[PDB]
Structure formats: structure tokens, C-alpha cells
Design a binder for this molecule. Structure first.
Ligand code: HWA
Ligand code: MN
Ligand code: MN
Length: 179
């Protein structure tokens, strides 16, 4: 599969490893669910890129569940912030709110709704990105400066166009696996 190769060649090895690990613990084969793999890596990379653009952010995504919950519980005890039911992706120490990051092949408002409805009754901030350079964020608060946002969007668009070079983008966009 080109898709498997694309992933190994366009994401850094820690991201790939982390994606593979997660898949293989829940019985998923990256060589089979290649769209899922690409999506997991893609979303991981966005999470990492988002935290890098500020110790503004605590990274929750990309850790095992024990460590993720340890971090969340720790943030809650020391801030007062209510505990989410789902593991979010980051915590913002400046705005003092968790963030859920969405990356979607569909329209951003569509995915935004899905997410807001999945974690309704949470006060988690939501930030959605597409592969078209659209974003949607709770209360149009986008958290990052334009440069950081622009860097994420360029990376996403670039993934898309790489997939398209390799005739993989049509499969990927018509799949929702990983969202
Ligand atoms: C399907 C999905 C989408 C996300 O954006 C996400 O953060 C998670 C997560 O498991 O943390 N899962
Ligand atoms: Mn997550
Ligand atoms: Mn997410």
C-alpha cells in the first residue's frame, strides 16, 4: 500500500510509532486501516504542532490513558477546572480550559457539530481544522496567533496534496475513519 509508505515517509517516526502503537493495542492493523493510520498521524501532528506554538499548552493526546488521566486529574486539582468525561487533546494554561482538536475531511461546521454534540455538557474549547484551510473554534476564539494557525493549515493542505500526488486523496476524503 502506497498509503502505508506515504505515512512512513511524511510523518516523523515518533508520530508513526505512537499511531501504530494505539492502533495495534485496539486490534487494528495499519497495513489494512491505512486511511485510519494516516488520519491518526495527521491529527497527532496537529496536536503536537498546536502545543509547540506555545509552556502555554499541556499535551494530553499522544500519552497512554494512565498518564493522560494523571495529567488531567493533576490540572483539575490545581486549577479547580471540572474534569471532562473524555480525554481532550490539550490544556491551555493561559485561558485555563481544555481544548479538543478536530481534523476533518468534511466541512468544518459539520465536524464541529459532531464534536460539540459528543462532549456537550463539557466546557471544553473546540478547534476544528480542515485540509482546505478552514477552521472553526468555540465562540470564534481560535486561541493561536495567525502565524501558528497558518502553519497548521499549510501542513494540512500539504498532506492533502501529497496524498493527491500519490492518487490517495480520494480514498482518504471519502473515508471518515479516524474522525
Ligand atoms: C476519533 C477521535 C478524534 C479526535 O479528534 C480525538 O482527539 C480522539 C481521541 O481519541 O482523543 N479521537
Ligand atoms: Mn484526543
Ligand atoms: Mn482530537
Amino acid at each position: 500500500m502506497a498509503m502505508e509508505d506515504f505515512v512512513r515517509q511524511c510523518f516523523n517516526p515518533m508520530i508513526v510509532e505512537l499511531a501504530e502503537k494505539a492502533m495495534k493495542e485496539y486490534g487494528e492493523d495499519p497495513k489494512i486501516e491505512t486511511n485510519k493510520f494516516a488520519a491518526i498521524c495527521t491529527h497527532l501532528e496537529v496536536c503536537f504542532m498546536y502545543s509547540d506554538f506555545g509552556h502555554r499548552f499541556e499535551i494530553i493526546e499522544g500519552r497512554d490513558r494512565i498518564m493522560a488521566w494523571t495529567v488531567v486529574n493533576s490540572i483539575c486539582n490545581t486549577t479547580g477546572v471540572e474534569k471532562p468525561k473524555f480525554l481532550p487533546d490539550l490544556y491551555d494554561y493561559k485561558e485555563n480550559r481544555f481544548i479538543e482538536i478536530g481534523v476533518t475531511r468534511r466541512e468544518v461546521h459539520i465536524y464541529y457539530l459532531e464534536k460539540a454534540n459528543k462532549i456537550k455538557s463539557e466546557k471544553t474549547h473546540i478547534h476544528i481544522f480542515s485540509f482546505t484551510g478552514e477552521e472553526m473554534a468555540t465562540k470564534a476564539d481560535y486561541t493561536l496567533d495567525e502565524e501558528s494557525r497558518a502553519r497548521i493549515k499549510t501542513r494540512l493542505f500539504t498532506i492533502r496534496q501529497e496524498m493527491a500526488s500519490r492518487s490517495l486523496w480520494d480514498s482518504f476524503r471519502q473515508s471518515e475513519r479516524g474522525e
